[PDB]
Design a protein around this nucleic acid. Structure first.
Ligand SMILES: [Ca+2]
Ligand SMILES: [Ca+2]
Length: 290
DNA sequence: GGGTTTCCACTTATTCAAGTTTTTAG
DNA sequence: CCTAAAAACTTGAATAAGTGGAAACC
């Protein structure tokens, strides 16, 4: 195939990517711990194709199943991490994950110098892991009773190719059949993301010249939606972005279906029985209906 | 060698994606 | 009346993040 666009790749990595650092107890390591560093992406078997395109683009990474319904692309070959670092130095992440990427660079530096085989090297990898993703494990915390200070990432959307990658991961295209003819057809575009990235989400309103932001939460967990319902905004500002900047994954299929329906709203055909039928058949075979 | 690296099978907590309603704007 | 648009919510699983186990390279 062809190279995945560098900016779509970072956009997909902001959404679905993950950086990893394993500090494991090992009775056979000079320092009692062995380490593994890398970057990984896990998807439904559905989108194995994405993983395989990212692999031939980077010429690194190993693909294996993850449970019965998922598939992962992991990169931990030390030398192959140079490729991941050459990418994100050129096409930096945008979300708070850039923080996890920076603590990923510092660990790579520790391991490039081979320090992680000496006592003080593992201590530094522990200070770093404390701030990366979910931080230290309890077994590991009680083993290392550390330093911190992680900066908040506050960047803006660099270009549209980034949005396509992010949306391919976090995007959502929905046809809302609203009761009451008694069935209003309303298109909906959604981006969902943890409240940790309030500032990025709010920039979608100005960046896309439409939409609105609301917060929901289940128990202690909160998140934000970016929602677009105005048809003219969807037909003129949202749809043209992703025609220009193609999406990846089966979600690409969902969008194309969304657009089929969009062209019916435009032609006013959804106000007729025969047209509302075709809209109903299109909703059936998209999203979880696919 | 054999410590260390790299890989393959697998698990889990929640952040997502997706869906369900009812109200408000025009 | 007549839709369009917005408000507000819930929910399960595809994520992200992590873990077990070991062949075997260097
Ligand atoms: Ca995400
Ligand atoms: Ca996704």
């Amino acid at each position: 195939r062809e190279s995945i666009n560098p900016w779509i790749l970072t956009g997909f990595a902001d959404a679905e990517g993950s950086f990893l650092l394993r500090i494991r107890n090992n009775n056979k390591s000079s320092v009692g711990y062995s380490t593994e560093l890398g970057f990984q992406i896990t998807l439904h078997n559905k989108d194995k194709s994405i993983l395989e395109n990212i692999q031939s683009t980077w010429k690194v990474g190993v693909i294996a199943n993850s449970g019965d319904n998922a598939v992962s692309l992991k990169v931990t070959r030390f030398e192959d991490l140079k490729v991941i670092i050459d990418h994100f130095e050129k096409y930096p992440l945008i979300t708070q994950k850039l923080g996890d990427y920076k603590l990923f660079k510092q660990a790579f530096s520790v391991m490039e110098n081979k320090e992680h085989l000496k006592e003080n090297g593992i201590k530094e990898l522990v200070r770093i892991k404390a701030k990366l993703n979910w931080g230290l494990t309890d077994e590991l915390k009680k083993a290392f009773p550390i330093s911190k200070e992680r900066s908040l990432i506050n960047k803006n959307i660099p270009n549209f190719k980034w949005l396509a990658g992010f949306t391919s991961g976090e995007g959502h295209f929905f046809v809302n059949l609203i009761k009451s003819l008694g069935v209003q057809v309303q298109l909906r575009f959604r981006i969902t993301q943890h409240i940790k990235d309030k500032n990025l989400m709010n920039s979608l309103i100005t960046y896309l010249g439409c939409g609105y932001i609301s917060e929901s939460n289940k128990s202690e967990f909160s998140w934000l939606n970016f929602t677009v319902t105005k048809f003219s905004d969807i037909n003129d500002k949202i749809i043209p972005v992703f025609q220009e900047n193609t999406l990846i994954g089966v979600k690409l299929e969902d969008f194309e279906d969304w657009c089929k329906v969009a062209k019916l709203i435009e032609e006013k055909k959804h106000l007729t029985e025969s047209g509302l039928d075709e809209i109903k058949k299109i909703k059936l075979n998209m999203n979880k209906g696919r």
